[PDB]
Write an enzyme that holds these catalytic residues in place. Structure first.
Site: not given
Ligand SMILES: [Cl-]
Ligand SMILES: [Cl-]
Ligand SMILES: [Cl-]
Ligand SMILES: [Cl-]
Ligand SMILES: [Cl-]
Ligand SMILES: [Cl-]
Ligand SMILES: [Cl-]
Ligand code: NA
Length: 129
Positions: A35, A46, A48, A50, A52, A59, A101
């Site tokens: 990562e 990202n 979209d 967003s 990280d 995110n 989650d």
């Protein structure tokens, strides 16, 4: 801060990630390697819109507030900038929520594609833990 491999393993263990939700410490180190290359200051945009943040590339769509991700949540109740600290506490505490989650570590694309199914114990080989 750019952590050493065993340095990060030790810090993650101290913070209780060893076998957290059943994921051995090597899984977490492997995820961090791919990562962020163990760099707390890593940021990546990202598709979209967003971003990280930090050692575990958490995110802004769901987990932290960076003030520029429309329609996003802040489920770890933290500014994203706090995830870039040399102290990994905020990252680890937020990661605990993420991995709980429902989808486990599959939330980390890089874990699923580069660590899952591999010999992850290699990542802590040689560390005094
Ligand atoms: Cl390494
Ligand atoms: Cl392991
Ligand atoms: Cl936002
Ligand atoms: Cl911007
Ligand atoms: Cl929220
Ligand atoms: Cl730390
Ligand atoms: Cl799981
Ligand atoms: Na957000």
């Amino acid at each position: 801060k750019v952590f050493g491999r065993c340095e990060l393993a030790a810090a993650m263990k101290r913070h209780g990630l060893d076998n957290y939700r059943g994921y051995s410490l090597g899984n977490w180190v492997c995820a961090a390697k791919f990562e962020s290359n163990f760099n707390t200051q890593a940021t990546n945009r990202n598709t979209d819109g967003s971003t990280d943040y930090g050692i575990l590339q958490i995110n802004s769509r769901w987990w932290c507030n960076d003030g520029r991700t429309p329609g996003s949540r802040n489920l770890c109740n933290i500014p994203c900038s706090a995830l870039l600290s040399s102290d990994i506490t905020a990252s680890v505490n937020c990661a605990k929520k993420i991995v709980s989650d429902g989808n486990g570590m599959n939330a980390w694309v890089a874990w699923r594609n580069r660590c899952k199914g591999t010999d992850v114990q290699a990542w802590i080989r040689g560390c005094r833990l």
